[PDB]
Amino acid sequence: TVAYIAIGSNLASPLEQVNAALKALGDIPESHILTVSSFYRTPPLGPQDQPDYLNAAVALETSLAPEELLNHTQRIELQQGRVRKAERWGPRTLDLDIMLFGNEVINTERLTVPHYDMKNRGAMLWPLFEIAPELVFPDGEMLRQILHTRAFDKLNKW
Ligand SMILES: Nc1ncnc2c1ncn2[C@@H]1O[C@H](COP(=O)(O)CP(=O)(O)OP(=O)(O)O)[C@@H](O)[C@H]1O
Ligand SMILES: [Cl-]
Ligand SMILES: [Mg+2]
Ligand SMILES: [Mg+2]
């Protein structure tokens, strides 16, 4: 099954964390990376104080069940999602979300797939469109259609 995973980091200098996460994704059992999108920059929410967000999309071929994959992405967030500062570990700065899982619709306590808000997020749709321009959602909506309808501004690469 082809799973699409959204990667985000709002660390001030996020490249090393993102690469560590990408490597870890490739190490997930019964799985392997098919392709990785470019890295996209989005300004912080509200207050300009915060760092920009680095966003990307990964296509992962996997024979794991959806919630088994979530266990692994959540493990990676616990293991690599926080960065040590001088005398303290920082908060979680890495976010791994399952955008799509094959052509499956999932609605459990732990999982909502397709991701509940992805159709509102250029930070998700643009990197996904780069790696899967012909993508069709479970309900028959096309990724191209969503982008065409909303006419989101394009995001700058990192
Ligand atoms: N498609 C999906 N991918 C990942 N987690 C998901 C998910 N659908 C539901 N969840 C649930 O989302 C819960 C909260 O995850 P968080 O990472 O804290 C939300 P977030 O990603 O910061 O915001 P967002 O969901 O608005 O993108 C998890 O405990 C997980 O069970
Ligand atoms: Cl660009
Ligand atoms: Mg998220
Ligand atoms: Mg998340």
Summarize the structure in words:
This protein has 158 residues and is α+β, with helices and mostly antiparallel strands. It has a single domain, classed as 7,8-Dihydro-6-hydroxymethylpterin-pyrophosphokinase HPPK (Alpha-Beta Plaits, 2-Layer Sandwich). It is built from four helices and ten strands. It has helices spanning 15-26, 66-80, 122-131, 143-150; strands at residues 2-9, 31-36, 40-42, 53-62, 82-84, 89-92, 94-101, 106-107, 112-113, 156-157. The strands form three sheets. Strands 1, 2, 3, 4, 7 and 10 form a six-stranded antiparallel β-sheet that branches. A two-stranded antiparallel sheet has the order 5-6. Strand 8 (106-107) and strand 9 (112-113) form a beta hairpin. The longest helix is centred in the middle third of the chain and has 15 residues, at 66-80. It is globular, with a radius of gyration of 15 Å. It starts with a strand and ends with a strand. The structure holds diphosphomethylphosphonic acid adenosyl ester, chloride ion and magnesium ion (2 copies). Residues 156-157 line the site of chloride ion.
Helix content: 25-40%
Assign the CATH architecture: 2-Layer Sandwich
Number of domains: 1
CATH superfamily: 7,8-Dihydro-6-hydroxymethylpterin-pyrophosphokinase HPPK
PDB class: transferase
Keywords: ATP-binding, Folate biosynthesis, Kinase, Nucleotide-binding, Transferase
Assembly: monomeric
Entry title: Crystal structure of E. coli HPPK(F123A) in complex with MgAMPCPP
